[PDB]
Design an enzyme around this catalytic site. Sequence first.
Site: not given
Ligand SMILES: OC[C@H]1O[C@H](O[C@@H]2C=CO[C@H](CO)[C@H]2O)C[C@@H](O)[C@@H]1O
Lengths: 854, 83
Positions: A452, A528
């Site tokens: 990710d 997301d």
């Molecule tokens: O690892 C946690 C989460 O990370 C990503 O989502 C984040 C959540 C909030 O804000 C930032 C945006 O600036 C994102 O990158 C992806 C998710 O799938 C994951 O669970």
Amino acid sequence: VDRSNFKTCDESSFCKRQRSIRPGLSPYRALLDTLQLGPDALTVHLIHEVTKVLLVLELQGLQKNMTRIRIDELEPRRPRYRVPDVLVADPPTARLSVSGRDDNSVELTVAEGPYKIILTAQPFRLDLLEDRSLLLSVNARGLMAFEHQRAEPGAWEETFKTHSDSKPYGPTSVGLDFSLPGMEHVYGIPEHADSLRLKVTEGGEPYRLYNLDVFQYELNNPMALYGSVPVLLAHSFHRDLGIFWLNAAETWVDISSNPQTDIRWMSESGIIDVFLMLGPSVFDVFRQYASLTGTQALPPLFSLGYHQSRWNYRDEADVLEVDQGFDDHNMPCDVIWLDIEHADGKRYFTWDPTRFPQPLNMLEHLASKRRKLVAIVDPHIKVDSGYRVHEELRNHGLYVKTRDGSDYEGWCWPGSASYPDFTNPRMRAWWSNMFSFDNYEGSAPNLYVWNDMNEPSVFNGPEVTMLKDAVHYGGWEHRDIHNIYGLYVHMATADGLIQRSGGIERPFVLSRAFFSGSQRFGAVWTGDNTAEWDHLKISIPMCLSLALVGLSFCGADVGGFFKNPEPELLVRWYQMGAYQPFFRAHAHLDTGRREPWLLASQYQDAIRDALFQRYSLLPFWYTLFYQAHKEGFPVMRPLWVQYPEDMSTFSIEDQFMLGDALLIHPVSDAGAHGVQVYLPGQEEVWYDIQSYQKHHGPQTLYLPVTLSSIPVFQRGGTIVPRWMRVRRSSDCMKDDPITLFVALSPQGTAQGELFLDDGHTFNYQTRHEFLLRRFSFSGSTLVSSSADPKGHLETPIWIERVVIMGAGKPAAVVLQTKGSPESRLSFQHDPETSVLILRKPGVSVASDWSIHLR
Amino acid sequence: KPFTCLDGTATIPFDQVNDDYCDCKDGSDEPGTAACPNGSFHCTNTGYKPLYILSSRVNDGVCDCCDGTDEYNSGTVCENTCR
Ligand SMILES: OC[C@H]1O[C@H](O[C@@H]2C=CO[C@H](CO)[C@H]2O)C[C@@H](O)[C@@H]1O
Ligand SMILES: *[C@@H]1O[C@H](CO)[C@@H](O[C@@H]2O[C@H](CO)[C@@H](O[C@@H]3O[C@H](CO)[C@@H](O)[C@H](O[C@H]4O[C@H](CO)[C@@H](O)[C@H](O)[C@@H]4O)[C@@H]3O)[C@H](O)[C@H]2NC(C)=O)[C@H](O)[C@H]1NC(C)=O
Ligand SMILES: OC[C@H]1OC=C[C@@H](O)[C@@H]1O
Ligand SMILES: [Ca+2]
Ligand SMILES: [Ca+2]
């Protein structure tokens, strides 16, 4: 979304400069005295009439109905970027012959025809034809723009909010326009939360391709999301065409209509490198693009099952309770996922010593249940002298640097973090080697990986990403390589999983960011999303846009990532997800727990039904993925791919097909009591897979639905294989008997294939250890034959049942197979539905056999 | 005499009992295999409390009965853990 955090075209100086050029007479002209023709290419100098800058055009005919156009400076101050590692081979060429020539034009024939290219010298233009049919023109609106490297607000130093780009090389953007006569419908260029059929951008923003982490992204807009695939498909009743713009820099795409569609690509840096894929069918375009960037990696079978995730399962006891929950509620599941809280303070490749003290023991318990685990590994490394990964990358100079030569430090999950330079091949080798069982302590063969934040996401960076002027391997700036950074993380992780097994085990890696070629490394997902009905709906056009450009292993978080879905929405999302290639439930840190047994019985039952449908269809899914891997054909398809002459299908995005056999119209509205299902095809028939009711195409059917309904229809003329014995995970099922579902066409025929192998190794390719069967029904006989005689496999799999839809009642059923006397099978027939069930054929799936009715 | 499904839906010869194909709507013809979707396998668990498991858990490679009798042709050899 906070739109002010992301640049509009007017806020990106190069986009504003390029987009300010309006249609007119191009200042570029070809100098035909400089024309040189060889067996592989035609080269000719181009000149800008005002600046006198000289460029070189390298024009090539290619095998399989393609043309490549490359334009670069004749004498550059410094070399321009050319995208590496995306193309799988140096494309085989086709010879260009001069068939006509005057003072302002050259007509070229590709090989022995019928394709031709007309080069006009003044103004510079290229026309691509098949015989007398004009397919596409290049620079027709005179929008070609090549900013040469020099020794104008924002042309040099440029600030966005609080971030300054020092821009040492100044304005270097490139852009070119394409005209598609007869085309009114274009698709592709993911990733956008928008319609499958792309919109005209004339009175608004162009589509943007710049891998970005967009918090709480919104729908029906052209903002750049996490991945970028610079491939555009054009469809009409008469033909299919594709444009592949091989550039890794920030790219903006303008679409305009006139019938004709014009496309303009505008990139920050690099060269102009474009492939024109001339079809003529959409399947020809898929093969063409696959010959350039490769095909979908064959997923291990378990990765096509159901994945249960959230941010975060608390500890080992929570993971084991979730595992036991699936079994206590009779719900299948192949994988349980561990998000960022599993690590020691977001130091990747580590385990929290209180929550996960014994990861090998947790993995052993999951292995005893024939399940896998997925652990998150992001490409940002905590700046911590006590963290070995950081110390090794720092000591080997493998981090991305700033212009002053210091290691770039930004902010992300672990606080201050550095970014490995994944464009460096030694960095990728180091990363792959970190996945060995000796290096990644606590990992085991049933542990797979999720990448990710690989855009890369930088919390304190411009647009939440890296500085444009950071420096990578070979001295290239971040602006030159941005859109392939995530692909490299994906690639290096997949190679790590292959290497740790001695090259035997197929990888499973999910990636957020991607580019052309990402299909070769695993799965992607739409990031997301939110627990809302319109996000459920948009999963179809988003994954279809990805499927069209080769990324078949796509999905969206089941239930939505942000917010709490109401139980009805969660049910409809499981049903949608059950018929999409990557099937994972995931949820944000602040959400309530939504493991499917926590709901009331009515909802649990509808979810279990959806899971059972998916698990029973695994042989079918596996076969479609094998066809994607071998041919480059999409798994999930828009209806227009199967019905190219049906103009009513060209914009459909609330329905899709899986291969040529199943048409799916998931319920996607709260309180729906029916759905309008369009069943296409003149003289085609469709069978409701639940009721067995036959429907003639073309028609719009108003189908009644309940909470447990998943509107699915099987096309007449197809044979779908299923594992009807649903067990707790795919490993449990992978040696079980098959039921063939034969849907008869109006002519009393049907066909279908089945791919089988061990479910997880490269043995199908290295040892030809697989089966590819063809099942064919015609004239009251069902036959199994080999579709690839090179494949042999030791397997206990047998045919336990045949279900024939649209069949009359026979007097007798006979089975013949080599090595056995003739057999008589018992059968059951429902005269209301015309469904015939053949009992226990009992034959090996590896054997040729025939069943005769009457 | 033939076998009658416990639900009275069919009468089949005893050669269709445990023949690894489901013939009864209640699954009663396949108590020893994984063939019926709504069948059950009886864990005799000699010396301890007997248990019933889902038919889909017969030869799934996972040890469900403490006596290990659910895994008889899967490749997983289950040890007796009844205590
Ligand atoms: O690892 C946690 C989460 O990370 C990503 O989502 C984040 C959540 C909030 O804000 C930032 C945006 O600036 C994102 O990158 C992806 C998710 O799938 C994951 O669970
Ligand atoms: C590279 O490009 C060439 C040239 O385009 C391409 O070959 C062509 O393929 C098309 C099929 O896509 C051929 O078209 C067919 O022609 C025959 C007559 O010879 C017709 O019978 C066919 O009709 C079917 O489809 C019609 C609707 O489109 C229906 O009305 C009809 O009932 C039929 O079902 C169809 O028109 C074409 O003949 C060839 N052309 C040449 C010159 O070979 C080739 O396939 C491409 N190769 C790759 C690798 O991409
Ligand atoms: O008698 C018919 C069959 O029934 C069961 C098993 C086989 O031994 C027999 O051939
Ligand atoms: Ca039986
Ligand atoms: Ca078992």
